[PDB]
TrEMBL record, chain A:
<comment type="similarity">
    <text>Belongs to the glycosyl hydrolase 10 (cellulase F) family.</text>
</comment>
<protein>
    <recommendedName>
        <fullName>Beta-xylanase</fullName>
    </recommendedName>
</protein>
């Protein structure tokens, strides 16, 4: 029930081959090629077993997006990734597995992007009931 | 302390004589007259005793702003208001007094507003506990 919310200005870019800039309080992203993406580090890691849901809030979405919750590996696991999401300003991933969530990411799967842009507003971690 | 964060889309407008619209995940405001303002209700009431600091995050600020933390009266108390703020994207009020915090506000004090606009991004409650 407890929610840890990070707005865009609290998320630092760890890696990204997309184009990104923090402007007007949002991470504004532009993608030029298939699988271009950004990875952000969390200010503090959160144990995976404590998290019920991770909700990404976006704005000005002009391309379907893929969302990732990392738990310490070189990439997010398939169970912690959702692909081709469109039509909402908030998307929820219910993650599972071991270790701690250290990062999140946004990626595109479109093979020939054109005017492929989106803004990240915030990422929210809702903890399981009784997880403190 | 623990931080309870409300982004713009979680904040409901209670009252406002400023112009306001929720766009691109932000409350976008325009002020045509002195003391024009918006008051938003919070998703939940928070006891004042439990609150250390309330931090307002803004974007595209084009006019100095005044910030308010309500605690049950028809207006926010002077102790819970800060006036004429400029130059930052985050401003903090350390509130005081009785009761529960259930709303926040943004106001302009400029006497002849011109292209007076600002966006609200989020409001953060830093708790003692
Ligand atoms: O419809 C859904 C399909 O889109 C989907 O396919 C998965 C799409 O993601 C694939 O994984 C990508 C592969 O690219 C990685 O990027 C590389 C990072 O290193 C760079 O050197 C390289 O240039 C990039 O390509 C990216 O991290 C990773 O996420 C995955 O293998 C596909 O399975 O599958 C589900 C369908 O429903
Ligand atoms: O707080 C302000 C005070 O410091 C200044 O002197 O006059 C105007 C007030 O708003
Ligand atoms: Cl803007
Ligand atoms: Cl926009």
């Amino acid at each position: 029930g407890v929610k840890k919310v990070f707005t865009a200005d609290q998320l630092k870019v760890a890696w990204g081959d997309a184009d990104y800039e923090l402007a007007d309080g949002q991470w504004k992203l532009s993608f030029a090629k298939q699988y271009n993406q950004v990875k952000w580090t969390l200010p503090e890691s959160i144990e995976m077993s404590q998290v019920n849901a991770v909700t990404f809030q976006v704005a000005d979405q002009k391309v379907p997006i893929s969302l990732k919750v990392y738990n310490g590996g070189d990439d997010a696991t398939a169970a912690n990734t959702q692909y081709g999401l469109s039509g909402q300003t908030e998307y929820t991933i219910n993650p599972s597995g071991d270790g701690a969530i250290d990062a999140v990411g946004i990626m595109i799967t479109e093979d020939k992007p054109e005017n492929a842009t989106v803004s990240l507003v915030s990422v929210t971690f809702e903890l399981k009931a009784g997880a403190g």
